[PDB]
């Protein structure tokens, strides 16, 4: 079943006061089952533990995420409202 | 840049979450701390020159088993 990002509830997040507001939501899946979600910057990168492996996740200007995800896992991005 | 560090902490209830957050907020160079994640089991820390291995050590001894889950830099254009 194609992961349906339109039916994913918002992450539980906090916009930290001393840094820019990040433009993206991310959602982490194992076997197409949501594991967690959060915020990240657009046109940027982050190191995240995805199950058994650290992954260097890149974001494009529209919050599309890419990385070398371990088998069975993926992290998908969406632009936040207003961004 | 500022760093953002996310740590998963074994935290039994809302008071243990309170205590892990108090411990982190007291740490050298922490600008801001929040409890995040679908299960409200992740501590997100933002600051300049935070020592993530010192921070994990402190949590492991005083609060609960802890796993580092994210390290990133704050984007400044």
Residue numbers in the entry:
A (entry chain C): 31 to 113
B (entry chain B): 187 to 263
Task: Provide the publication's sentences verbatim.
Intracellular nucleotide binding, leucine-rich repeat (NLR) receptors are key components of plant innate immunity pathways. The integrated HMA domain in the sensor NLR Pik-1 directly binds the effector AVR-Pik. The Pikp NLR allele only responds to the effector variant AVR-PikD, but the Pikm allele responds to AVR-PikD, AVR-PikE, and AVR-PikA. Here, we graft an interface from Pikm onto Pikp by mutating two residues in Pikp (Asn261Lys, Lys262Glu), forming PikpNK-KE.
To this end, we determined the crystal structures of Pikp-HMANK-KE bound to AVR-PikD, and to AVR-PikE. Each complex was crystallized and X-ray diffraction data were collected at the Diamond Light Source (Oxford, UK) to 1.6 Å and 1.85 Å resolution, respectively. The overall architecture of these complexes is the same as that observed for all Pik-HMA/AVR-Pik effector structures. A key interaction at interface 3, one of the previously defined Pik-HMA–AVR-Pik interfaces, involves a lysine residue (Lys262 in Pikp and Pikm) that forms intimate contacts within a pocket on the effector surface. In order to position this lysine in the effector pocket, Pikp has to loop-out regions adjacent to this residue, compromising the packing at the interface (De la Concepcion et al., 2018, Figure 3A, B, C and D). In the PikpNK-KE mutant, the position of this key lysine is shifted one residue to the N-terminus compared to that in the wild-type, so that it occupies the same position in the PikpNK-KE sequence as in the Pikm sequence. The cell-death response to AVR-PikD mediated by PikpNK-KE is similar but elevated when compared to that mediated by Pikp.
